[PDB]
mmCIF file of C-alpha atoms and ligand atoms in Angstrom:
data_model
loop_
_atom_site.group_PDB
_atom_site.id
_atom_site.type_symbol
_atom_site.label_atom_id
_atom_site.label_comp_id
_atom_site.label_asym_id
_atom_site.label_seq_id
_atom_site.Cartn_x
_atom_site.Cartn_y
_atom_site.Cartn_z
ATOM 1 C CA UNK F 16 43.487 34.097 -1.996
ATOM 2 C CA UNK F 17 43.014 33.577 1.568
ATOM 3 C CA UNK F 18 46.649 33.299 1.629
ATOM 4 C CA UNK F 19 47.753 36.628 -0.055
ATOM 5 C CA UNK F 20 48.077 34.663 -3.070
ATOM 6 C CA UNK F 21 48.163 30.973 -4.436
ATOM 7 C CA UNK F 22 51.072 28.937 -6.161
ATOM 8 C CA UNK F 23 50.445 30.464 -9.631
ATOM 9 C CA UNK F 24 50.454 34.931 -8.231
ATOM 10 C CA UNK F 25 54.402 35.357 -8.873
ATOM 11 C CA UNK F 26 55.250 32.909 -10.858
ATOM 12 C CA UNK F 27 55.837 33.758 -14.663
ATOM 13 C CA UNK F 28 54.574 31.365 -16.570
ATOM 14 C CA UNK F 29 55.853 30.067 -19.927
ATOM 15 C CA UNK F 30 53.230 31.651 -21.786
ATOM 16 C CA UNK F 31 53.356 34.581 -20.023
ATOM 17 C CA UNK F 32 57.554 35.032 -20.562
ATOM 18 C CA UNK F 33 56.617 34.897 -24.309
ATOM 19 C CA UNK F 34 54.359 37.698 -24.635
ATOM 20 C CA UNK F 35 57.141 39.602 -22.188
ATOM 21 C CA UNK F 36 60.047 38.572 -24.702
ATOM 22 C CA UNK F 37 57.868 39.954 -27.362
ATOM 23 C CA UNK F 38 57.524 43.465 -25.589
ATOM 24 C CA UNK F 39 61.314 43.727 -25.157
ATOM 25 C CA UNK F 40 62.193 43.106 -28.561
ATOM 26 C CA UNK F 41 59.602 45.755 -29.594
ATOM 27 C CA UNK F 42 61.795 48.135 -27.359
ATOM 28 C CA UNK F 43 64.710 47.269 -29.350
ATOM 29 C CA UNK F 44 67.445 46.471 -26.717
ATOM 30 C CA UNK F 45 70.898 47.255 -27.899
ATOM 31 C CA UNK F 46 72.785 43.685 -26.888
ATOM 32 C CA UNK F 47 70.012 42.599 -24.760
ATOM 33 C CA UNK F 48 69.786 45.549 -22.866
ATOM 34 C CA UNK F 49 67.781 48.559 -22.228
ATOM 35 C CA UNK F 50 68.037 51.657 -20.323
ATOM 36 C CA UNK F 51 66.781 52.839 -17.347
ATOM 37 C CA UNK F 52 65.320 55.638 -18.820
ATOM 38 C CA UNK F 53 63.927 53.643 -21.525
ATOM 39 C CA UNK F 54 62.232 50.915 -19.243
ATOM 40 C CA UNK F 55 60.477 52.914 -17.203
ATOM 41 C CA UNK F 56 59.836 55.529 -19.540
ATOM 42 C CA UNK F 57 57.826 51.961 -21.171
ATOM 43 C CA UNK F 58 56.392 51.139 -17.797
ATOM 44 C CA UNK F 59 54.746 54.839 -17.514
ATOM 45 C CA UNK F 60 52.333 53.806 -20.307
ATOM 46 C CA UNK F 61 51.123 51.505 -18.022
ATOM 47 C CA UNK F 62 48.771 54.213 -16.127
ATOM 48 C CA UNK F 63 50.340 52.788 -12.562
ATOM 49 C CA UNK F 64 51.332 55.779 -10.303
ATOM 50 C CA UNK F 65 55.042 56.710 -10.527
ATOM 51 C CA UNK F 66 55.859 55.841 -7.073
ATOM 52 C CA UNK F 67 54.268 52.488 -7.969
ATOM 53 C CA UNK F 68 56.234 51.906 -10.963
ATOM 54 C CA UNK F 69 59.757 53.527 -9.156
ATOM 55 C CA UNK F 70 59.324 50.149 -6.808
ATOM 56 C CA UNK F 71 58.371 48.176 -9.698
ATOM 57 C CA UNK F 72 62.197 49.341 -11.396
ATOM 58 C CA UNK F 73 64.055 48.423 -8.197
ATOM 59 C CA UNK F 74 62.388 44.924 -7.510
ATOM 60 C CA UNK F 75 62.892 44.254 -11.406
ATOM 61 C CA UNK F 76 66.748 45.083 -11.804
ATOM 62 C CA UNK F 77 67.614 42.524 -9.595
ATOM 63 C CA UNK F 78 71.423 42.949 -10.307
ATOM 64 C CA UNK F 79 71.164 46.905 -9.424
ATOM 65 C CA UNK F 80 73.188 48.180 -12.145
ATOM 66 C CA UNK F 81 70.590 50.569 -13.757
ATOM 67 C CA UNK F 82 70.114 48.884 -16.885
ATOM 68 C CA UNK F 83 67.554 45.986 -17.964
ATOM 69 C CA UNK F 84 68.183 42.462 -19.309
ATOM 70 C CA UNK F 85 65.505 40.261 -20.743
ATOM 71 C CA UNK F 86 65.066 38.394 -17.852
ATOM 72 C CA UNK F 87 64.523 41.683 -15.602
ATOM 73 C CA UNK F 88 61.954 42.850 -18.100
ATOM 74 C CA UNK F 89 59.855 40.015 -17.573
ATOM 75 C CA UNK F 90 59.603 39.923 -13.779
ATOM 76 C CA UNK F 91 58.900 44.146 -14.142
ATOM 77 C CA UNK F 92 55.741 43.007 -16.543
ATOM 78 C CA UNK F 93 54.644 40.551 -14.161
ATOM 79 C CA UNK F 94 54.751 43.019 -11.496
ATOM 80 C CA UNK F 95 52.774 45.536 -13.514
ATOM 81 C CA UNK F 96 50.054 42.755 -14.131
ATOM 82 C CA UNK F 97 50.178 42.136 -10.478
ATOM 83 C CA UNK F 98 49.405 46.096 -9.014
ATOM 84 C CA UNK F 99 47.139 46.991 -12.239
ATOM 85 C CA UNK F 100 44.781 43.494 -11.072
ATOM 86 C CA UNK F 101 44.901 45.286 -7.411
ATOM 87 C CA UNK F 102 47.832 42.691 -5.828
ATOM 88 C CA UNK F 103 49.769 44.664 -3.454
ATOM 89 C CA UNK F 104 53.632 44.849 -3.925
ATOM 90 C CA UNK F 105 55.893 42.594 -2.354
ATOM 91 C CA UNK F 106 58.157 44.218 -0.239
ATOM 92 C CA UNK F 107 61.534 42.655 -1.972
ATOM 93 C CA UNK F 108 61.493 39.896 -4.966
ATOM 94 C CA UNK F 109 59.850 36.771 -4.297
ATOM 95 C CA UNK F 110 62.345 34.265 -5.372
ATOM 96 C CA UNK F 111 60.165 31.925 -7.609
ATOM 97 C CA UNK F 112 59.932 35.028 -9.518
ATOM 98 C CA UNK F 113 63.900 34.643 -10.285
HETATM 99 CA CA1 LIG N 1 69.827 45.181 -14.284
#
């Protein structure tokens, strides 16, 4: 956009929250959680850079503590969309992403 992006760049949209919720479970979170490791050893198949996909990790985990909830996993897919469709990064979590 003429804007650097419109109503609909960073918000996750019902749809879109689906097909993340899918991915997750296909991860197979132990109590709603993955790993670290595990998330962004997921979000290297993505073909993003690494230092790309390190920022991606610390937008996502919003609550810092390493590990990744449903709701974290989501935002980190949007974000992945985002850079591979040539968006730049935002420099800390837009909050209609939350
Ligand atoms: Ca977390």
């Amino acid at each position: 956009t003429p804007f650097g992006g419109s109503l609909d760049t960073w918000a996750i949209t019902v749809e879109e929250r689906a097909k993340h919720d899918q991915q997750f479970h296909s991860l197979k979170p132990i109590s709603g959680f993955i790993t670290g490791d595990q998330a962004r050893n997921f979000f290297f198949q993505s073909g993003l850079p690494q230092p790309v996909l390190a920022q991606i990790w610390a937008l996502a985990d919003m609550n810092n503590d390493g590990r990744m909830d449903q709701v974290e996993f989501s935002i980190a897919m949007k974000l992945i969309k985002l850079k591979l469709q040539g968006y730049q990064l935002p420099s800390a979590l837009p909050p209609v992403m939350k």
